[PDB]
Design a binder for this molecule. Structure first.
Ligand code: BCL
Ligand code: BCL
Ligand code: BCL
Ligand code: BPH
Ligand code: BPH
Ligand code: BPH
Ligand code: U10
Ligand code: U10
Ligand code: CRT
Ligand code: FE
Lengths: 237, 266, 296
């Protein structure tokens, strides 16, 4: 056998690789890529089959491959002529949420843990939840990349299941509160430094509808706005 | 999706100049540098195939300048072409890393992938730049050949007896083995969840975390296991690069004899 | 990276299912150590019968090997701690057959200890099926663990019986197994020309390529909640979206937050799958791989 077995194994691999693996990646990524001819750059094969996900506690059925387009508008005028170029933004990309600022319209509902309840809600609303090591961010000045303070930390919003600080609630100087991703700030002892953003603005962060819960839609809008600041804020590089 | 992301920007070196996409592939300054370098090393290998009379990949090989040349130069055919191809390999690897750095900026994403890739580069440069320079002769390095580098592997392994006994190597292996287990387990965990027992509703991280506590009695975070992947693999190749940088430079002996340090006093 | 602030609240239990045996310990949180990297909560564990069966036979195996090691050092501190690595529990080696049961120091020792290691591991398989069933998860973890069990089974049970002798099995000793692995190369005509070992190394390297890559992309897509893999699979947004656009713009193709885990299970299980296949042949069919190569 042996030479039979190694030949057979290389057959198997050819099976495995495209007709499970890359087929199952075609299921969303980027879903019969069209801005012109939908497959074309190289011979694929094919677009996988529908698979439906019944979504947990509540309602849902996701059938992928997704027949979907975001119309919800990409404010991007194309630099054209040699057709494969950068699409420029028509106005301020940051507010328009495009490029490194891009949000995705996910669901405008909060993600509810294993037993239908908000995954992230603020520490005010968490039963005996409090900071067990490291600087306590609450009450620190919040300073942006241009070294100017744009508020103060008021609360930590925590993921309960996998117990973790996910957001900081920052009260801007005028009682407006902004939510800010923990993965974007540097909690020191004398200030909390947000490098991605300018102080004088910060204000532009998408606002929450309830003050005690954030939706998937909103999370993406906040995080996207923040990250885009890294490119789009000339006071830093 | 894609389209809203294709905005003009990022780019370390190369200004506006190179900011375009050849289809899926972003180009950029380090994109053309990767191309330029891969073309040069391919030409020089094609050239060493011709100079030995084979175009077959089981047989095409490029070996280093033999021990007497030191860290000097060699004739292309008596060593020099491995040397030039190394420069194109290091150049083409470092461009690719800095190619990733530029796509990162444009995607407003984190630097972690180039940082991880730099470790594979470090391992490579151990064998090819650092351990030879340390040992005085480029010839200690490995030949660029599908079979002939395993020939080099077995000879250097066996020049020290059973090279399992090299301590930093033992633990490098220990991470390689743990990281594979960690991958099988992690992938299998998410697919335990996203694809539940037939007509069930999708599971939760809460289910994931609970499964691993029932088996083991702990569950690192979801964030935590991706912190774990990155570290097990970069330790496996760190300790691997150490293992192959002490041997030859400070341990010049049959590795079995290390352990006798422990074996005597009582 | 590392946590900056640790946040705690009470303990958790997201249904540890049938007969609620799964509460041994309830808690024991580690902050300063486990919580700066991962989660802090230690426990609760399940332990139900098979879990006791594995730990009983696992410990038993481990202890058996220990009484023979002490016999090798007689009884001693000093000497025992000195030669821990160098002790061994070689098979009936004394290579005279499968021959059902050899004398205690000649084969007994090993067959007895192997019995407990056989039971310990198989019951733990059983466990991984059950613990999954109960949370309505589905077999994946006990899909993967079978290729591990495959390489284990070919190196100790199935190849020694395919060779008609228990002597072809691996010893229970630290240094012994490092040597057995070397000699198996030597007496099989330089195992590098074994086509399967070449694929196994390609996949073992491939796994440290892929978890390094995966790990690094989620940690780079951390700030858009990318670690919430299971959610992004149910309703995709930015972090999933531009995590994959990184690889499409670098190497030319990409993955779905689900599907990269479909790549990764396989990219790891193929290490002991192919490898196991490779050892099953090395002795049993191909006497010498150098020759095998040449003769085509
Ligand atoms: C055979 C003789 C000896 C022995 C001799 C040696 C020797 C000699 C060496 C090792 C090394 C290693 N050995 Mg050993 N080893 C033995 C037995 C074993 C056993 C075993 C089961 O017994 C195991 C598990 C190992 C394990 C290991 C690894 C820990 C280590 C490999 C490091 C690494 O992955 O490098 C990291 C990987 C790289 C360097 C790859 C870098 C890739 C670069 C960046 C990019 C390439 C780009 C590509 C060309 C682009 C193509 C683009 C196309 C589009 C595709 N050895 C026996 C006893 N071992 C090596 C080591 O320590 O590592 C330095 C080493 O030199
Ligand atoms: C795969 C080829 C060889 C082999 C080659 C090697 C080599 C080479 C090395 C080891 C090493 C180890 N081997 Mg081994 N080992 C084999 C089969 C086994 C079997 C088994 C099938 O039951 C076991 C229990 C072990 C166990 C062990 C550990 C004691 C040790 C660290 C492993 C690790 O990283 O695990 C991690 C698992 C968890 C953390 C869980 N080996 C086969 C026979 N093993 C390493 C060592 O340093 O030895 C002391 C080492 O360098
Ligand atoms: C790590 C220690 C040794 C070494 C030891 C081995 C050993 C041992 C084996 C290989 C094998 C391979 N090596 Mg090597 N190899 C080394 C350095 C390299 C470098 C380099 C630029 O440094 C490259 C490009 C390669 C490339 C290759 C591939 C052609 C082949 C499959 C690799 C793989 O799994 O990748 C993963 C990549 C993707 C999944 C993409 N090696 C160093 C010098 N290499 C395997 C082979 O099949 O060769 C016959 C094999 O068994
Ligand atoms: C491609 C296959 C890869 C793989 C996969 C894999 N392993 C797996 C699984 C999978 C998918 C499991 O689900 C199962 C698991 O439960 O994981 C946590 C497991 C597992 N893989 C393990 C080990 C392991 N896997 C290995 C390799 C691999 N596993 C491959 C890389 C290796 C090697 C040889 O490097 C090892 C050592 C086990 C930890 C675990 C379960 C095996 C089992 O059944 O264990 C039962 C054992 C006992 C009851 C006896 C325990 C006795 C010891 C506690 C004695 C003392 C040890 C000592 C070092 C001190 C104590 C240490 C600490 C506890 C303080
Ligand atoms: C923690 C380190 C681990 C790691 C990580 C890693 N590898 C990475 C990354 C990361 C994080 C990438 O981002 C990058 C990637 O884009 O992946 C698709 C990559 C990558 N790792 C690769 C391979 C690779 N990594 C390896 C190992 C590892 N990579 C470690 C396990 C190995 C081996 C053998 O273990 C290999 C073969 C590539 C698939 C990919 C991209 C590397 C790259 O630079 O691509 C550019 C391509 C060219 C410039 C064409 C090459 C032209 C040269 C002139 C040829 C030179 C010849 C060479 C010197 C010798 C060939 C001889 C051998 C056959 C003996
Ligand atoms: C000098 C010896 C030569 C050699 C030999 C060799 N390699 C081998 C073998 C041998 C004899 C194998 O059997 C194994 C293989 O499968 O062969 C294809 C392997 C192998 N050599 C490998 C790599 C390798 N070999 C190399 C070289 C060589 N290998 C040398 C030429 C190299 C080099 C030089 O680059 C590499 C990278 C791997 C690909 C493969 C081993 C695959 C692997 O990672 O799997 C380990 C997993 C197991 C052994 C399964 C165990 C699962 C059980 C369920 C665990 C039970 C646990 C227990 C109860 C205790 C639990 C403790 C805990 C609770 C703490
Ligand atoms: C996203 O998914 C995932 C999670 O979810 C968020 C996870 O938690 C985890 C993390 C879970 C782990 C178990 C860690 C994985 C890493 C490993 C190296 C494997 C486990 C290592 C062990 C040593 C297992 C323990 C072994 C045995 C035999 C059980 C011990 C028996 C007891 C009774 C324990 C009591 C202790 C004394 C992973 C991997 C994951 O991928
Ligand atoms: C969860 O998140 C994640 C994703 O997202 C959801 C992901 O997708 C992925 C990645 C996706 C996968 C499916 C994993 C891939 C599987 C692997 C085993 C690793 C890759 C292995 C390969 C064999 C790929 C081939 C490797 C490379 C490097 C391809 C490069 C090929 C070329 C032809 C080079 C071209 C380069 C350049 C710079 C072109 C420039 C062109 C010009 C014309 C320039 C001249 C100018 C004019 C991961 C890891 C992930 O974790
Ligand atoms: C007494 O002392 C104290 C209390 C201090 C205990 C201390 C113990 C110490 C000091 C050390 C223990 C060391 C050990 C256990 C080291 C083991 C290491 C390794 C490398 C072991 C790896 C071997 C892999 C093997 C042999 C894999 C295969 C096993 C097989 C498949 C088992 C099945 C075999 C047979 C006989 C089953 C027959 C079954 C039936 C049904 C019939
Ligand atoms: Fe993951």
């Amino acid at each position: 056998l042996a030479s039979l077995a190694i030949y057979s194994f290389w057959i198997f691999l050819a099976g495995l690789i495209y007709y499970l693996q890359t087929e199952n990646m075609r299921e969303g990524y980027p879903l019969e890529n069209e801005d012109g001819t939908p497959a074309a750059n190289q011979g694929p094969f094919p677009l996988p089959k529908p698979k439906t996900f019944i979504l947990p506690h509540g309602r849902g059925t996701l059938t992928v491959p997704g027949p979907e387009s975001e119309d919800r508008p990409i404010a991007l005028a194309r630099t054209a002529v040699s057709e494969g170029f950068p699409h420029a933004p028509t106005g301020d990309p940051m507010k328009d949420g495009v490029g490194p600022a891009s949000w995705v319209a996910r669901r405008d509902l909060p993600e509810l843990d294993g037993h239908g309840h908000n995954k992230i809600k603020p520490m005010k609303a968490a039963a005996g939840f409090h900071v067990s090591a490291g600087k306590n961010p609450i009450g620190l000045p919040v300073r942006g990349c241009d070294l100017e303070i744009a508020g103060k930390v008021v609360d930590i919003w925590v993921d309960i299941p996998e117990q973790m600080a996910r957001f900081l609630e920052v009260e801007l100087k005028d009682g407006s509160t902004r939510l800010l991703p923990m993965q974007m700030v540097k909690v020191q002892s004398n200030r909390v430094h947000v490098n991605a953003l300018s102080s004088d603005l910060f204000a532009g962060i998408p606002t929450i509808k309830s003050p005690t819960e954030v939706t998937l839609l909103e999370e993406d809008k906040i995080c996207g706005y923040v990250a885009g600041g890294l490119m789009y804020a000339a006071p830093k590089r | 999706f894609e389209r809203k992301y294709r905005v003009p920007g990022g780019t370390l070196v190369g200004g506006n100049l190179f900011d375009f996409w050849v289809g899926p592939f972003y180009v950029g300054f380090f994109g053309v540098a990767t191309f330029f370098f891969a073309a040069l090393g391919i030409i020089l290998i094609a050239w060493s195939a011709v100079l030995q009379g084979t175009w077959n990949p089981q047989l095409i090989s490029v070996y280093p300048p033999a021990l007497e040349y030191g860290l000097g130069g060699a004739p292309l055919a008596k060593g020099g072409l491995w040397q030039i191809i190394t420069i194109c390999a290091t150049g083409a690897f470092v461009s690719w890393a800095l190619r990733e750095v530029e796509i990162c900026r444009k995607l407003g994403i984190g630097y972690h992938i180039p940082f991880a890739f730099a470790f594979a580069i470090l391992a490579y440069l151990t064998l090819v730049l650092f351990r030879p320079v340390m040992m005085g002769a480029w010839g200690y390095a490995f030949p660029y050949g599908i079979w002939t580098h395993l020939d080099w592997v077995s000879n250097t392994g066996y020049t020290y007896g059973n090279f399992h006994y090299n301590p930093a190597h033992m633990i490098a292996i220990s991470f390689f083995f743990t990281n594979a287990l960690a991958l099988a387990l992690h992938g299998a965990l998410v697919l335990s969840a996203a694809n539940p027992e037939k007509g069930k509703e999708m599971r939760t991280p809460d289910h994931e975390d609970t499964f691993f506590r029932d088996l083991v009695g702990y569950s690192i975070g979801t964030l935590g296991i991706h912190r774990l992947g990155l570290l097990l693999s970069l330790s496996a190749v760190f300790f691997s690069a150490l293992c192959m940088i002490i041997t030859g430079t400070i341990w010049f002996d049959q590795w079995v004899d290390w352990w006798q340090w422990w074996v005597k006093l009582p | 990276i590392f946590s900056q602030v640790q946040v705690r609240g009470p303990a958790d239990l997201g249904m540890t299912e049938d007969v609620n045996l799964a509460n041994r310990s309830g808690v024991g949180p580690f902050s300063t150590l486990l919580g700066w990297f991962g989660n802090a909560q230690l426990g609760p564990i399940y332990l139900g019968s098979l879990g006791v069966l594995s730990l009983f036979s696992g410990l038993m195996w481990f202890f058996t090997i220990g009484i023979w090691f002490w016999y090798q050092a007689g009884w001693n501190p000093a000497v025992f701690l000195r030669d821990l690595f160098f002790f061994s529990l070689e098979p009936p080696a004394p290579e005279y057959g499968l021959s059902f049961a050899a004398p205690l120091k000649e084969g007994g020792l090993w067959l007895i200890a192997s019995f407990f290691m056989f039971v310990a591991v198989w019951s733990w398989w059983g466990r991984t099926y059950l613990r999954a069933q109960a949370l309505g998860m589905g077999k994946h973890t006990a899909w993967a663990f079978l290729s591990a069990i495959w390489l284990w089974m070919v190196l100790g049970f199935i190849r020694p019986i395919l060779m008609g002798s228990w002597s072809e099995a691996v010893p229970y000793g630290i240094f012994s197994h490092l040597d057995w692995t070397n000699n198996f190369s030597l007496v099989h005509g330089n195992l590098f020309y074994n086509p399967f070992l070449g694929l196994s190394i390609a996949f073992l390297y491939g796994s440290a390529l892929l978890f390094a890559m995966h790990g690094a992309t989620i940690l780079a897509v951390s700030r858009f909640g990318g670690e919430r893999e299971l959610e992004q699979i149910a309703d995709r947004g930015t972090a999933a979206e531009r995590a994959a656009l990184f690889w499409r713009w670098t190497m030319g193709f990409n993955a779905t937050m689900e599907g990269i885990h479909r790549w990764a299970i396989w990219m790891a299980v193929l290490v002991t799958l192919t490898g196991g296949i490779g050892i099953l042949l090395s002795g049993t069919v191909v006497d010498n791989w150098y020759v095998w190569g040449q003769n085509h």
